[PDB]
Ligand binder design. Structure first.
Ligand SMILES: [As]
Ligand SMILES: [Zn+2]
Length: 193
């Protein structure tokens, strides 16, 4: 099982999220209290990389999903057969991969040879000039309620900062729910606090 231990590392690596709120029109919204992202299928999911100092050239940013619950954690998170077989290809992403990056022609996808786990990696870019963070647009290509894969089992996304040689520079994570009404579902999951 890949580590999910938070690790700010040498560069002070942390995640940020847009403050999108829970209006019914929201397609992507993050709950600080639950550290949980609520997303519509295949919609832009902005994840902000915040660093205290700029990591070197060739730094890369990896995303990987694992099941949150210990009893499922060894199971590879992958798209259900239906979504696997859907005609929603962007021509870069493997059809089985739950997490894609959109709007980045330098995206790289990995099926780990030994663990079989899926990940998607992009070059780290410094914040645009005048910005304080780097935003990656992720897409989640299968629903939490999909019976053929996650089937209501919660998943985590682990975001890793690695150098060009693959050494770990930093790590963070957040829970993800892929659903029809993220605004409503966030608001609802938060009313039980
Ligand atoms: As999202
Ligand atoms: Zn699915």
């Amino acid at each position: 099982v890949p580590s999910q231990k938070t690790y700010q590392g040498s560069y002070g690596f942390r995640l940020g999220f847009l403050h999108s709120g829970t209006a019914k029109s929201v397609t992507c919204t993050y709950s600080p209290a639950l550290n949980k992202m609520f997303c519509q299928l295949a919609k832009t999911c902005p994840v902000q990389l915040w660093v205290d100092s700029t990591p070197p050239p060739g730094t890369r940013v990896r995303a990987m999903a694992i099941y949150k619950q210990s009893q499922h954690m060894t199971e590879v998170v992958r798209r259900c057969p239906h979504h696997e077989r859907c005609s929603d290809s962007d021509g870069l992403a493997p059809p089985q991969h739950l997490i894609r990056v959109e709007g980045n022609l330098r995206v790289e996808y990995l099926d780990d040879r030994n663990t079989f786990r899926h990940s998607v990696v992009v070059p780290y870019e410094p914040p645009e000039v005048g910005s304080d963070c780097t935003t990656i647009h992720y897409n989640y290509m299968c629903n939490s309620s999909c019976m053929g894969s996650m089937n209501r089992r919660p998943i985590l996304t682990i975001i890793t900062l690695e150098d060009s040689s693959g050494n770990l520079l930093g790590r963070n994570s957040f829970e993800v729910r892929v659903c029809a009404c993220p605004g409503r579902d966030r608001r609802t999951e938060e009313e039980n606090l």
